[PDB]
Amino acid sequence: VNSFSGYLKLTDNVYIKNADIVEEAKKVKPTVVVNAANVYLKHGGGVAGALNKATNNAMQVESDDYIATNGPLKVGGSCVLSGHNLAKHCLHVVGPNVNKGEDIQLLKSAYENFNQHEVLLAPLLSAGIFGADPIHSLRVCVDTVRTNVYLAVFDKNLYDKLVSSFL
């Protein structure tokens, strides 16, 4: 497990790669994979939908079981569930959605959940439909995460911009 290869080292504990996170998980077999989730743990698009489809909807049925007892998650909160065939554990983290007016300061609180796990395979948080600048999100990651995080970035153009600014 944790057979990470081909990653570019940005800091002493942050690594980056231009790759598909679902294909990486099947190749690395990580201990933890991170899901960019919403407060109701509905995996209907983005990274969440791709992970759930790779689990043949096993992630969605487990997520609904957790919501039935916990209710909605808080922005910046997280929960650890099973990783099914993709990893041992899946950490669902809810970043702030600046389109809904949620505070961008809460992105530090979202990344702080990574410090509960020794090594993670993760995407960037609060980007895309959550509306935060991906370069800003990566800045908050390298500033708050003290454990080993391996970042998969799908877009080649975005990948080159992040590398040019952080290496």
Author numbering: 3 to 169
What did the study's authors say about this model?
ADRP-APO1 was refined to 2.01 Å resolution. The protein crystallized in space group P1, with two molecules in the unit cell. None of the polypeptides contains ligand in the catalytic pocket, but there is an N-cyclohexyl-2-aminoethanesulfonic acid (CHES) molecule bound on the surface. In the ADRP-APO1 structure, while the described geometry of the β6–η3–α5 linker remains similar to that in ADRP-APO2, the entire section and the neighbouring η1 are shifted away from the binding pocket.
